């Protein structure tokens, strides 16, 4: 239903959709990542993703992919989070 | 003569084949330097009676046992094969 849990590319929501973090968001991200041990930085996924949501208002696929790229995580490990938690707006 | 191959059969852990392993480690190197282009095959197996197969031209093979020898009997048999 409305919460489909799948993603079919569109012009508004595609990997080429223009998302990117602001130089302030990057420093906030650095701090967040610093709030966790040095080997475990894949735990900032939730705060960084909600941050992107705040900047952009919602979450397109490019946003998740960029979060992954930043944290060096597989993007599916971010798709799972986004789909699981409801505070994350994918429309 | 018409010798083409020498293929040595033996065991890895057995007394009878003890003469072939010593022979190998001490002289296979020098012998394969002397005859560089001659196959000298060692196919060591388990619970196999050691033998020396010398096959000459037109597919004709010989076989002389090596059970419970020293390395010197092995050397003499191998050189007898080589010479003919």
């Amino acid at each position: 239903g409305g919460a489909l849990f799948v993603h079919r590319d569109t012009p508004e929501n595609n990997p080429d959709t223009p998302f990117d973090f602001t130089p302030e968001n990057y420093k906030r991200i650095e701090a967040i990542v610093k709030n966790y041990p040095e080997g475990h930085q894949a735990a900032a996924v939730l705060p960084v993703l909600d941050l992107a949501q705040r900047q952009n208002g919602w979450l397109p696929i490019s946003a998740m992919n960029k979060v992954a790229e930043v944290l060096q995580v597989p993007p599916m490990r971010v798709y799972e989070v986004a789909t699981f938690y409801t505070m994350y707006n994918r429309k | 003569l018409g010798l083409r191959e020498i293929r040595v059969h033996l065991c890895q852990r057995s007394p009878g084949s003890q003469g072939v392993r010593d022979f190998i480690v001490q002289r296979y190197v020098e012998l394969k330097k002397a005859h560089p282009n001659l196959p000298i095959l060692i196919r060591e197996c388990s619970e196999v009676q050691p033998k020396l197969w010398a096959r000459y031209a037109f597919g004709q093979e010989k076989t002389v046992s090596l059970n419970n020898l020293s390395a010197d009997e092995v050397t003499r048999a191998m050189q007898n094969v080589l010479s003919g």
Partner: protein
């Protein structure tokens, strides 16, 4: 009726009506059937089987069915151990190539390994 000294190897070929062909030219296989990986059941990996060599199968021109001149194409015997099968084969005069039984090796397993501080067992898929 006391005992008798036979002192030879058993041979039953002459009493089984089996033709020379299917005794001399037959290679039996003795084995424990391998588990089917489409399933995790291990109850068909217990009893030893005896299976014969496969022979020709040609389509029937009329319909297109599989034909054979091999009576033993579907012969399967079930034994509780390896020596029993070897004895049956020797007795009936067949040639056999045996295949040892494959038991999985015991494996260390821990649910905590999935959650580790420094090892690579740490999984990202709960």
């Amino acid at each position: 009726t006391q005992l008798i000294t036979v002192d030879e190897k058993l041979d039953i070929t002459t009493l089984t009506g089996v033709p020379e062909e299917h005794i001399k030219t037959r290679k039996v296989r003795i084995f424990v059937p391998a588990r089917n990986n489409m399933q995790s059941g291990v109850n068909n990996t217990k009893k030893w089987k005896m299976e014969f060599d496969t022979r020709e199968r040609w389509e029937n021109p009329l319909m297109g069915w599989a034909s054979t001149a091999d009576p033993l194409s579907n012969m399967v015997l079930t034994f509780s151990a390896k020596e029993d099968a070897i004895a049956f084969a020797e007795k009936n005069g067949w040639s056999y190539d045996v295949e040892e039984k494959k038991v999985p090796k015991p494996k260390s397993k821990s649910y905590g390994a999935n959650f580790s501080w420094n090892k690579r067992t740490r999984v990202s898929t709960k």
